[PDB]
């Protein structure tokens with residue numbers, strides 16, 4: 001008893017969606033696919049619909065698409081993009097070739113805010129609080145974001161925030177080259193493949209983000225990998241003996257020991273005028289050694305979030321089986337799996 005679809009040439013492609021979705025307008029296209037805004041007559045919500053482009057053109061692609069669908073279907077938290085609906089005009093696995101994803105329309109990312117507004121210390125408390133709240137949830141499911149940036153953070157007029165972008169194709173080296181904001185928020189360990197990274201990489205991103213909202217400027221706006229690494233070490237000091245031994249890459253560790261030793265600066269003199277509690281939290285987040293970096297759970301209990309902290313209202317996620325990450329299958333099988341997920345989907349209770 002499927003809906004009734006209608007075709008329409010939006011942007012370079014022909015979107016075929018259920019009748020419930022009207023007034024679709026372009027929002028942006030890319031290798032990932034195409035995104036449209038629309039009004040969901042069945043719920044009265046304004047939504048954003050994404051049509052995946054060539055989801056099963058390769059094994060690497062069919063797998064990515066399965067990953068993204070699995071991630072989005074799993075997310076059930078207020079500060080994390082939830083999946084309101086997912087459909088395909090296809091009537092059987094044989095026809096199956098298109099995938100459409102539907103989620104809330106927030107309206108603006110975090111870049112807009114920090115540009116056309118003035119953030120009080122109270123605002124920074126609320127915004128970062130929600131990022132950390134959603135992060136405690138994500139990490140509790142052994143899920144790593146890996147790419148937290150202001151553009152991956154959606155906010156509405158009420159200043160409520162939702163973390164976005166999961167299971168997206170990794171950034172090409174060209175995308176990480178030069179004076180680009182796509183690298184400014186990454187932790188040094190992944191930016192230079194120092195070791196096997198983990199969730200602590202997101203905490204570093206939050207640090208970079210929180211600093212920007214407080215000062216209104218990018219924390220480590222490097223013109224390239226090396227220049228960015230220098231800006232970092234300049235603030236947090238050069239690696240100690242303990243951190244060097246953890247750097248698996250003999251090449252990277254080699255380049256590091258060639259840099260003149262520098263002491264960790266004084267955050268109080270760097271972030272002048274900032275809430276002393278903000279400064280302290282920033283020192284707990286921006287720690288070069290990832291093992292000693294504060295966790296999201298620990299940060300939420302930090303005095304800087306007293307006004308908002310609520311130990312009974314910061315839920316964790318259910319188990320997320322991602323054993324498929326090390327499974328070797330053919331396009332067809334990844335595709336069939338994706339299809340099963342689409343049909344087994346269950347709309348949010350509301």
Ligand SMILES: O=C1NCc2nc(Sc3ccc(F)cc3F)c(C3=CCNCC3)cc2N1c1c(Cl)cccc1Cl
Nearest residue numbers: 028035048049050101102103104105106107108109154
């Ligand atoms: O407000 C929202 N809500 C959801 C959303 N999802 C996406 S992608 C996407 C993912 C899952 C899904 F079900 C549905 C989805 F659409 C993008 C995109 C990410 C990459 N670039 C293109 C769009 C932008 C938004 N914006 C948005 C933001 Cl944060 C700022 C300005 C305008 C909008 Cl519509």
